[PDB]
Amino acid sequence: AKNKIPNSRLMINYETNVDGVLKKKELPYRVLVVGDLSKGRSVDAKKEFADREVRRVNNGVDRVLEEMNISFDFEAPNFVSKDPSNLKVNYRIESVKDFRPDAVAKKVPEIRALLEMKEILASFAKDIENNRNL
């Protein structure tokens, strides 16, 4: 209250106010990198250069990537499935291990058809049935 309490004969108050200049936390040595990553295929890449929010990679290159919608619909020679039409690789990059010749066969729908058989066909127990023993 600004009105202020009436002063007694022995007014004790206890000062709790402290002045001083606030501190400043250190600056992380930032490193900017500039290169054609998306080739023109990302949320921040498809936008005009006047407004491209720079990333940070707080987490890692695995998640800062998935943050960007990096997909691609490029054609490729077909050697799986029936009917015409060249194989159309179409899936968005999540991690950096996506270019691994393995995560590809898991992503591309057509190739996965052959990998699906290798789970069932190759798992034929011709060792449990052949091993009859009376």
Partner: protein, 427 residues
């Protein structure tokens, strides 16, 4: 026989262009953000070279209006609460073209002001050769640049902005091609895939510019030390341990393939430093590297007066302009706090000196790291008020960094005059 398909199906798109273009442009991104230090936050900005080519070439004579310049200088470095950048990294390869020369002229125009040494790489098209390995055949690049083909380039080396550009030579192998016995594709828990080959032979299976490891050492030379003395030489900075080599069985017995694009000799390490290039030289077989030279593209000159000659030798040196830059990030950053406080010529000389004082010595500490804590040797700071403007000042510092080793000649000889007691007449 389903393996025969997959070994053809997948191998059709891994070898495909565009697909492996992203690989190159992400593998070398992962390479930078692999270390992860205590206080070194990297950051990305995916932009096509053309989208910047058009930018600087349109605003070369009006850089303050450049869109990029407005996303590094006046955006984070200039503004109050903004966090400034430090040492940009150009993931591109620059030729001797009269277009790509502007690209550097512009980016350097920014770096110069934003105080952020722009590191990049140069294509094999620079030396006018279609295979970078064939640069070893050139005797001295010093005599090369005298050729009138580099006229445009020699003009750029004279610009002030070029003292912030730092171009690297050589490209490290960033991925080992896929063999079953070597670097097997990690298949799934049932889908047999590890039996899977690729298709390469001579020299065409993914590369990445040395600039990465260069910057990825500046980061290292910050978490450990604090300044940028720790990015040169073997014992000191650039060592770059454990690179992705390659091995292959053509007919012999797994003949290893050196991780580096080119096996620079000794006088190559030097004969490049004079051109204003940063060679990424390899130790034969050791599967490692090191940066001996870290020079900017600035001309070294020569001069008659000894002092002047030494000036130009230190200015061309990138590692110092990295450090001197860190003082700018101190002034335009910290003194902003006391912008309204009543201060004097004798007070600003206090605040600015009391800081830098902890980083200047003459005595040498054991080991390189324990001494690289101290970049500078000695500093002067003569600020002084100007007439007219009462609250304004004008500083003028001058720093002499700890001069690095760079080489030496030596003449051995049998004197037989040192100890005359054995060869003298009197006996």
């Amino acid at each position: 026989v389903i393996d025969k398909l997959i070994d053809l199906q997948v191998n059709s798109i891994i070898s495909n262009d565009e697909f492996r273009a992203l690989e190159q442009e992400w593998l070398k991104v992962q390479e930078v953000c692999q270390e992860d230090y205590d206080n070194v936050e990297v950051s990305i900005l995916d932009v096509k070279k053309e989208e910047l080519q058009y930018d600087f070439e349109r605003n070369l004579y009006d850089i303050s209006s450049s869109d990029f310049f407005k996303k590094v200088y006046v955006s984070e470095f200039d503004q109050y609460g903004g966090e400034p950048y430090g040492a940009i990294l150009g993931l591109y390869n620059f030729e001797n073209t009269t277009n790509d020369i502007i690209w550097l002229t512009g980016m350097g125009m920014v770096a110069k002001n934003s105080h952020a040494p722009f590191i990049a790489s140069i294509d094999k098209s620079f030396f006018g050769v279609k295979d970078l390995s064939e640069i070893t055949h050139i005797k001295s690049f010093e005599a090369l640049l005298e050729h009138p083909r580099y006229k445009e380039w020699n003009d750029f080396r004279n610009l002030d902005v070029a003292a912030y550009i730092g171009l690297t030579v050589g490209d490290f192998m960033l991925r080992q091609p896929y063999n079953p016995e070597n670097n097997p594709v990690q298949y799934k828990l049932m889908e047999g895939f590890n039996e899977f080959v690729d298709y390469d032979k001579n020299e065409s299976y993914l590369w990445g510019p040395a600039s990465i490891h260069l910057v990825k050492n500046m980061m290292r030379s910050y978490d450990k030390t604090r300044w940028f003395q720790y990015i040169r030489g073997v014992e000191s900075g650039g060592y770059v341990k454990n690179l992705v080599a390659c091995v292959y069985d053509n007919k012999g017995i797994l003949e290893t393939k050196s991780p580096l694009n080119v096996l620079f000799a000794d006088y190559m390490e030097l004969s490049l430093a004079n051109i204003g290039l940063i060679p990424f030289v390899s130790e034969k077989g050791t599967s490692n590297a090191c940066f001996f030279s870290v020079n900017s593209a600035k001309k070294v000159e020569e001069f008659v007066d000894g002092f002047d000659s030494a000036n130009s030798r230190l200015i061309a040196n990138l590692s110092y302009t990295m450090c001197i830059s860190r003082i700018s990030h101190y002034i335009k950053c910290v003194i902003r706090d006391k912008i309204g406080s009543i201060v004097d010529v004798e007070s600003i000389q206090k605040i600015l000196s009391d800081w830098i004082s902890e980083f200047v010595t003459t005595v040498y500490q054991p080991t390189p790291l324990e001494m690289a804590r101290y970049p500078f040797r000695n500093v002067s700071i003569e600020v002084k008020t100007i007439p007219g403007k009462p609250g304004w000042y004008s500083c003028k510092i001058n720093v002499i960094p700890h001069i690095q080793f760079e080489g030496m000649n030596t003449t051995m000889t049998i004197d037989t005059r040192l100890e005359p007691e054995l060869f003298g007449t009197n006996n």
